[PDB]
Amino acid sequence: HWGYGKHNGPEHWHKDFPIAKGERQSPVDIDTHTAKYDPSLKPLSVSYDQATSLRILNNGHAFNVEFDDSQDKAVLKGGPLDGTYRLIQFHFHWGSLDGQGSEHTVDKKKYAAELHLVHWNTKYGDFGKAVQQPDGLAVLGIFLKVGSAKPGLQKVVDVLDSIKTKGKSADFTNFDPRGLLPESLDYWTYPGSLTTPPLLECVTWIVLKEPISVSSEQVLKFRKLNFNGEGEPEELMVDNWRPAQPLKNRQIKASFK
Numbered sequence: 472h473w474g475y476g477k478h479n480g481p482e483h484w485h486k487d488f489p490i491a492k493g494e495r496q497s498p499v500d501i502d503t504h505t506a507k508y509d510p511s512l513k514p515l516s517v518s519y520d521q522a523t524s525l526r527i528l529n530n531g532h533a534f535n536v537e538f539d540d541s542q543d544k545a546v547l548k549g550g551p552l553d554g555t556y557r558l559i560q561f562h563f564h565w566g567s568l569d570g571q572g573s574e575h576t577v578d579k580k581k582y583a584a585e586l587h588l589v590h591w592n593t594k595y596g597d598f599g600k601a602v603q604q605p606d607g608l609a610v611l612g613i614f615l616k617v618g619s620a621k622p623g624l625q626k627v628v629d630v631l632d633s634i635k636t637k638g639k640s641a642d643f644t645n646f647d648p649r650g651l652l653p654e655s656l657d658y659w660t661y662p663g664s665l666t667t668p669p670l671l672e673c674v675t676w677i678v679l680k681e682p683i684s685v686s687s688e689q690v691l692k693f694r695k696l697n698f699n700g701e702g703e704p705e706e707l708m709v710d711n712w713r714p715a716q717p718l719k720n721r722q723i724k725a726s727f728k
């Protein structure tokens with residue numbers, strides 16, 4: 472099955488998932504000088520005050536913090552979006568080294584990691600239906616660089632020892648994702664895809680200009696996770712990112728001048 476190794480990595484995905492070579496694949500390089508300011512873009516509306524986190528899961532590709540998405544408790548609206556998108560989970564992609572790890576790049580620059588807050592369009596009723604629609608998902612992407620610690624991330628870091636291997640989950644209630652956001656909500660936006668199989672072309676990407684900083688100790692703890700299940704040969708969960716894909720017939724829009 473698919474993964475991030477030499478024999479099952481991003482270069483191989485197209486064989487099982489031909490959409491990997493499609494017209495609106497993610498991630499992409501964000502060329503800051505070619506992106507166009509769109510003064511008609513509304514400010515992002517992030518309403519996470521009633522968020523209800525439930526669980527944290529190691530799924531063998533990353534770890535997801537999952538939320539109760541059975542009502543409008545934590546939603547994203549505005550920006551390039553029409554309607555309401557409900558937060559279902561967030562996860563990260565990261566590197567084996569601080570110099571790589573993000574999926575999107577900015578003028579070819581790689582960050583140490585990238586946070587994805589995944590939301591689905593409520594007009595489609597549930598996540599499974601949404602991923603089958605061109606405007607089904609909105610993913611808010613946030614770059615991580617290594618520097619000072621991110622206090623709001625620490626609760627996540629501290630539970631990782633309990634979900635070291637594939638298939639492990641742990642209760643994770645009362646986590647506030649507002650603690651993972653940078654100060655500015657300035658963003659770039661473009662139409663794209665899931666960055667892992669099945670690579671469905673259902674995502675409006677909203678990538679924040681301002682990275683958050685996390686400590687070297689924090690990202691080191693990400694790199695102690697395992698891709699494998701318990702009792703299988705240990706393979707560290709690192710470099711779980713897809714490289715930048717061709718932009719093709721798309722324009723990246725900026726919310727800021």
Ligand SMILES: NS(=O)(=O)c1ccc(NC(=O)Cc2cccs2)c(F)c1
Pocket residue numbers: 587589602610664665666667668669670
């Ligand atoms: N890295 S990402 O583009 O933000 C992403 C990548 C994958 C999923 N989820 C799934 O792929 C789960 C699905 C299985 C079958 C259809 S969707 C997701 F919800 C978000």
Ligand SMILES: [Zn+2]
Pocket residue numbers: 562563564587666
């Ligand atoms: Zn992701």
